[PDB]
Amino acid sequence: IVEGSDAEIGMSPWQVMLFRKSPQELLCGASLISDRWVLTAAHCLLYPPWDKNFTENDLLVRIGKHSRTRYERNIEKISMLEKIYIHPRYNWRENLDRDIALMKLKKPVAFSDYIHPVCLPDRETAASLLQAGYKGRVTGWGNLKETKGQPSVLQVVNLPIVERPVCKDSTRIRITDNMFCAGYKPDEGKRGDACEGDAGGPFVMKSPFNNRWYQMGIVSWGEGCDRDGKYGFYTHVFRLKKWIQKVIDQF
């Protein structure tokens, strides 16, 4: 996260860290959506141009974390994966269309002050809140600047949703209805973005209708980070909710 600040304790209790056991590495962010399901970006699991194609046995998730590198005993919970499900129409060859994956935990996790699931939006919440100029919130342990600069604790930044024609005109990459972008325009007098290491983390919004937090997006891709006239791109969660439902209902 670029131009963010330190999260407060328990501020994002749905934040999940995808972690490589050996050699030990933070891989990506993710989000807790129930006691047994975690949502992430498809490219955090499958990206053949980078020789990346993880199996379940390949990764761990770390839930309830704040420190990037400390083992937060009695606070964080570490879980093994039972199965990974990647969207069958995930477009890794081109533009990362449908950059979404689900991970089933081997055992349900216990909730605490630090561990608590986010809501996924219903059709009406998604239509109401996904509007240009409203702000959502992105969190992660990714790079602090375009370049190795890495935070000591979870970072947060709030960013406005950008109108689709501005998202489109900002990039030569083909954008789709399964994506949205967020960030300040040049001349809006504020900055901020997600960055490398933040993918799979949640773009969330607080409902004024019921005070609940909803995950509208998944950090997916960009062109550099926090550049003037560029915007962060996020997987459109609600647009892909029929798939999430299909997977969870079948396992």
Partner: peptide, 25 residues
């Protein structure tokens, strides 16, 4: 039509150098 500059948002490191603290067993 060009994805030449597309930067998927995950890459990684142990920034202090060589270290996350161990966990589990």
């Amino acid at each position: 039509a060009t994805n030449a500059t597309l930067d998927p948002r995950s890459f990684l490191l142990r920034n202090p150098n060589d270290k996350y603290e161990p966990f589990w067993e």
